[PDB]
């Protein structure tokens, strides 16, 4: 503060002007070839055709996800990094406690080649694996869709049914309850054991828990990010022997401790 | 050329120095805002002089990655999450062509497996969601099913169709009017005339949908959201 503070601030202004001038000169020397980085224009939630996505309070939507148009997402659901939910020509509905994994595409159609064109309906407690493609089809509650699987228009995945990782499910195919289908084209592989039904449920609840920590981290402000960076650096290593000499016990701050429901045990 | 790269390199030295000077000036004023972790994603990215040339009438989603020498024609559209990387060779997209969400159009990263082929996409082409195109040619008015993979040297002739989830092996030629699918991709049947009509009309519909999404994205960034993010506690 005071006169010294003001003088140092003015000198900082001069230094900033000089630095930005040097940056401009360096840009000129590069032949202006470098496209400049800019403020991020990606919108996590966007309207189109006067349709606004309806997203429940406690839904993790990763900032890099794209939720566009007429999309409804229910309680406890999670949309992960790089997901695209494009509800522009038709409706997309996601039930409660359903996870849409990273880099997944969900889309709809305005008019199919033949039959009744239907919206994309994803039920409750559904797991959809990484990089899946869901197009104009219906996934009923407690179903599992493997990573990298493709569901074409009119496909119905029934309750407690599984689509294996990597499968290509042709248009209008029906996956009956209790069966697992896979391959390209997808076809019946075998019945689902009871332990696998329990797995599907477990998948869904584990995701519900994972979504909480990811949502908490992605929503932190600049100041909290800096505070936690400093705290993480301070507690990354230890000298418990010198602490015992000092007669103190350093405790990990609670903002660095994860909840027990996401820990391996 | 070599002189251009030398000046580009020297330019980086000057720029690095100027930005460091600016950070010093901010530090003297007690500002730490340069420490903020802000995304360095660029929708269009140059690799030295190899830069994307995009037509003014083409929609490119902000989250898409266009890297190096990539040409996009009028009325064409690059959708959300798409990646187009032409650095070792070029990638060209014709007019009225849609590249759907999460698709990947790239060339061989190295010439170890031989000369790196370019990727040529003709006019009024549909490239389905999450398709992979790797150093191939896709002629006008063809259909690439979503989730399909086309390897280098492949040629998809006009009105050809690649079924969803197909794996077209290296150097395979897809003849006109034919539907190929499966892993490996094989002849399935002939294309019907209704399918040709749907190819054209779906492409024209995508160009209109592109227009709508480009207008949506071009709207000014909301300042209320900015203030909400700034004033969080």
């Amino acid at each position: 503060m005071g006169t010294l503070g003001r003088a140092i601030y003015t000198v900082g202004n001069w230094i900033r002007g000089t630095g930005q001038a040097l940056d401009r000169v360096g840009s000129l020397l590069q032949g202006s070839h470098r496209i400049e980085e800019h403020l991020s224009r990606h919108r996590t939630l966007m309207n189109v055709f006067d349709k606004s996505p309806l997203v429940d309070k406690d839904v993790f939507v990763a900032p890099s996800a794209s939720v566009i148009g007429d999309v409804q997402i229910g309680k406890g659901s999670s949309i992960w990094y790089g997901c695209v939910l494009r509800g522009d020509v038709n409706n997309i509905s996601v039930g409660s406690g359903t996870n849409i994994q990273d880099n997944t595409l969900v889309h709809v159609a305005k008019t199919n080649i033949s039959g009744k064109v239907l919206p994309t309906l994803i039920g409750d407690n559904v797991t959809v694996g990484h990089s899946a493609v869901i197009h104009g089809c219906t996934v009923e509650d407690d179903a599992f869709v493997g990573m990298g699987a493709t569901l074409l228009d009119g496909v119905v995945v029934e309750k407690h049914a599984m689509v294996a990782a990597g499968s290509l499910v042709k248009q209008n195919t029906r996956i009956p309850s209790g069966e697992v289908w896979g391959g390209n084209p997808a076809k019946f592989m075998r019945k689902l054991t009871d332990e696998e039904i329990v797995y599907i449920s477990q998948s869904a609840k584990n995701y519900i828990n994972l979504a909480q920590i990811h949502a908490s981290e992605n929503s932190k402000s600049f100041e909290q990010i800096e505070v936690e960076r400093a705290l993480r650096k301070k507690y990354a290593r230890k000298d418990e022997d010198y602490d015992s000499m000092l007669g103190i016990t350093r405790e990990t701050p609670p903002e660095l401790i994860l909840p027990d429901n996401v820990l391996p045990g | 050329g070599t002189l251009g790269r030398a000046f580009y390199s020297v330019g980086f030295w000057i720029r690095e120095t100027g930005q460091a000077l600016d950070r010093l000036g901010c530090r003297l004023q007690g500002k730490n805002y340069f420490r903020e972790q802000l995304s360095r994603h660029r929708t269009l990215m140059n690799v030295f002089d190899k830069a994307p040339i995009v037509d003014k009438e083409a929609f490119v989603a902000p989250s898409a990655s266009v890297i190096g020498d990539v040409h996009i024609g009028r009325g064409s559209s690059i959708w959300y999450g798409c990646v187009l990387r032409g650095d070792v060779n070029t990638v060209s997209v014709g007019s009225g062509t849609n590249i759907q969400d999460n698709s990947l159009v790239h060339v061989a990263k190295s010439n170890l497996s031989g000369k790196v082929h370019p990727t040529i996409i003709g006019d009024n082409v549909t490239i389905g969601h999450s398709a992979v195109l790797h150093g191939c040619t896709v002629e006008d008015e063809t259909f690439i099913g979503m989730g399909a993979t086309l390897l280098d040297g492949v040629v998809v002739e006009k009105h050809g169709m690649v079924a969803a989830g197909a794996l077209v092996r290296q150097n395979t030629r897809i003849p006109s009017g034919e539907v190929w699918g499966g892993n490996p991709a094989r002849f399935l049947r002939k294309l019907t005339d209704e399918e040709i009509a749907f190819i054209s009309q779906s492409a024209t519909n995508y160009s209109n949908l592109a227009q709508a999404h480009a207008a949506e994205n071009a709207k000014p960034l909301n300042v209320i959201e900015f203030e909400k993010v700034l004033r969080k506690k």
Binding site: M1, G2, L4, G5, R6, I8, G12 | L28, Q29
Partner: peptide, 29 residues
């Protein structure tokens, strides 16, 4: 308008004094 961290300002003065005094030390020797 003003830098408020007093200790930082004092350190800035100390660095400036070191630089200028070093220049004078070289010049007058």
């Amino acid at each position: 308008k003003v830098s408020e961290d007093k200790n930082r300002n004092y350190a800035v003065v100390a660095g400036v004094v070191a630089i200028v005094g070093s220049i004078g030390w070289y010049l007058k020797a």
